[PDB]
Amino acid sequence: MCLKLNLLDHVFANPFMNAAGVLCCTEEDLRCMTASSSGALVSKSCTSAPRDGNPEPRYMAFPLGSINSMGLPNLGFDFYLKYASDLHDYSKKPLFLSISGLSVEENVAMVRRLAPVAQEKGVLLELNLSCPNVPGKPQVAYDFEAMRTYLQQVSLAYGLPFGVKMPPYFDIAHFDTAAAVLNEFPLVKFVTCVNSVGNGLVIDAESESVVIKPKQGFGGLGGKYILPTALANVNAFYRRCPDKLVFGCGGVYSGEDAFLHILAGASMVQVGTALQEEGPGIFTRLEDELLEIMARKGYRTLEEFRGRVKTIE
Template sequence: MSLATKFGGYTYENPFMNASGVHCMSTDELDEMDNSRAGSFITKSATTSHRAGNPEPRYFSVPLGSINSMGLPNQGIDYYLNYVLDRQKSHPDSSPVFFSVAGMSVEENLNLLKKIQDSDFNGTTELNFSCPNVPGKPQVAYDFEMTQEILSKVFEFFKKPLGVKMPPFFDFAHFDAMANILNQFPLAYVNCINSVGNGLYIDVETETVVIKPKDGFGGLGGEYVKPTALANVRAFYTRLNPSIKIIGTGGIKTGQDAFEHLLCGATMLQVGTELYKEGVSIFERLEKELKEIMEKKGYSTIDDLRGKLNSL
């Protein structure tokens, strides 16, 4: 029984990671991820310099998940780049980690990626095309022309492994159109999905919203979004070039949730809301539960089941 996953030329002990934005703001949190049972981890989506993010409260746990409008709080790219470069020197034999960037403009995205290209970072970079929680800014991935323009400019100079994090899509025509764009580029992976944007949760006792930014509108995560996440993983797995891997994110709370993402075609799995609620001990539990399901079903490796979802 093995949960080993091959990704980007490396083998990871298991497919589990944190979702960018959760348990990765500080070096202390990144160290905890590194020392956990997770197969790998990703840094907080970085901008050029430190961002305080949106006013609090900006995250709220609800019975079936979470709602947040964080506003990209982060320590700036140098903080995270120095961390991953130091880790490379101190752990030369470890599988490389993932580095997330999310510029507030096309120009900033290009500059962030140029900095990574010019550095000694040997891992995989994730370009966040889905930031639904920044007031006044649309999600890049919902502007198909902009998505194509950015990727065209990026791959003129960026030669390291690059993946993109996508918001959810809800229409077959959009799956088709976005896949046609993504297939034009040598992407390492597509991450499906970021939070479902602009939900609203109400506290009936106080008759108010539960987060401060955007009059209470925020991205939904957790159990709420799993069916949407699974649909996006499956839709892109069946449309993208086989060389483009899928990272499944959204609603992973149990080993069964992980199994479902893998069945839809995911190669690695990111955990957000439930990691926030449980802490890094969740990875040990998920690993155990996934192995139990695979053993019960007679699967000895993840490759035996990945993408094998049946239709009726």
């Protein structure tokens, strides 16, 4: 029995990694994720220039999950490119690099510089089309024409395999249209479902006030709140994109939650809110818990149950 897997021409000790934005902004953060038991890591979504992000308080956690409006705080593309080119030890585990430009032009500028480093070192691109927290900037992938434009321009300028981070959808027609767009692009090798559930609102009953400062209290939701939403999106894209991989993200706290994502179709499994709250020790616990479920059910490898969720009748 083992958790080993091979995909995208890389070898992984296990399917677990951080979700983009959690424990991955500074060199210190990245070294910490590398020293953990995780199978891989991804860097903070970056822009051409460094950003301070939105005013504090901008993150708050609760029993059922988290709300945030960070505002894309990051050290700038030059820093994350240098980490991938000169600093990361690829003998420990694979590295993904996330980008989130504020226009199609900004993304194209970054991928032109990323390409030679990807060719030499094997760093893997995750393109973020789902940030719900920059004021005046609605989620790119909720506009299918803008989506098609970003993907055409990036494919042409990069010319190498990449993946896409998607927002959650709630409508069968939207699942149908979005997956069809993705299937037009052979360079898109993986689809990560999902980013935060956008523009929720948490209110404190005692103080009668919202709990985060930006955007009048409105922010993206993660954790226990979003698990059935995340599983729905993972399965919807697994069914509709049979020639691509799907990565699961949303509501993972336990080996059982990871088992459900994998049954739905997930290859890698990403951990956000639960990692932010518990710290990187979570990865040894998730491995132990998934192996014990597999033992009890008589499963020896991940391929024996990936995508095998059963429907009724």
